[PDB]
Amino acid sequence: VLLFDEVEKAHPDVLTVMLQMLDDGRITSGQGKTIDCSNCIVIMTSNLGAEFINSQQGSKIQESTKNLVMGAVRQHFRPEFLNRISSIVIFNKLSRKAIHKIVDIRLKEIEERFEQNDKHYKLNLTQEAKDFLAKYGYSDDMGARPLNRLIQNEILNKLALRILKNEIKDKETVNVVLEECLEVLPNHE
């Protein structure tokens, strides 16, 4: 799978080259050898529609907004480029319900990043924290991303300190502050 992050910034000249890649897979090397990559998947991303997604016209992107985005795309890339795209997809605005689901997922990832069993949550507050985080991360302007900041700033930074202070051995708990904080299990042990 090829991934071209922020294709809108790529100079049109390279996109011109991508035209070969995107049709018949005949991207060739500098030395004249043909690659033949028709078996691959090519994904490119961009922010061209931001000015219209920011119209806030629904969660599922509504009509008109989608069309204005298409407009931005057409005004940015040459038609020959766009014509070689199998599908142009516009992502949806991450609604509160999406945020709740996202929070569940992100918290799981945090556990997956825990290489050792001294970094482990029971978490608790599966409704309270979930709600807190969901409300605070519900911002169209950053998509799902501020959730990463919420978790770090409200949960992990504090955890780091609790670890340094030996206030945790394993099986951590998050507590509600009128904000969030962590339980002291052992205490400077």
Binding site: T16, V17, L19, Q20, R26, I27, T28, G30, Q31, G32, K33, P79, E80, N83
Partner: protein, 144 residues
């Protein structure tokens, strides 16, 4: 028996070097006529182009076309109109195989590499294997 200027030598040279036009083929129906029909069968519309190519190709028959000029076309038009599909179909007819067309990746060009990747370079430069797209093909495929 003997060596016939046409039926023996012209045809012999063609067997050796390629060059269908010197095979002095018995049929311009199963070489030109069918060309227009089949190119038209697969490429819808652009009949004008099909005929332009077929006729340019027609002139090469028996070597009538200018000894120093390749049949040559420039295809302009709406993308999605078969600007390269026709070319493949022409190869599809000429070599009875669309994949025999030599594609030149012009999409990637800079005056500092643009010629060299086609024709390669001179001695003293990293890598000789000259001819990426043109020299290395044209040396072996005279009527590609």
């Amino acid at each position: 028996q003997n060596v016939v200027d046409s039926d023996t030598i012209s045809e012999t040279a063609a067997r050796l070097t390629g060059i269908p036009v010197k095979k002095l083929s018995e049929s311009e129906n199963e070489k030109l006529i069918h060309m227009e029909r089949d190119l038209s069968s697969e490429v819808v519309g652009q009949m004008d182009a099909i005929k332009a190519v077929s006729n340019a190709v027609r002139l090469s028959r028996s070597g009538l076309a200018n000894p120093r000029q390749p049949a040559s076309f420039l295809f302009l038009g709406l993308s999605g109109s078969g600007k390269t599909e026709l070319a493949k179909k022409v190869a599809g007819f000429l070599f009875n195989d669309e994949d025999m067309m030599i594609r030149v990746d012009c999409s990637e060009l800079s005056e500092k590499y643009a010629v060299s990747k086609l024709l390669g370079t001179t001695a003293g430069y990293v890598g000789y294997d000259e001819g990426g797209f043109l020299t290395n093909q044209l040396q072996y495929k005279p009527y590609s």
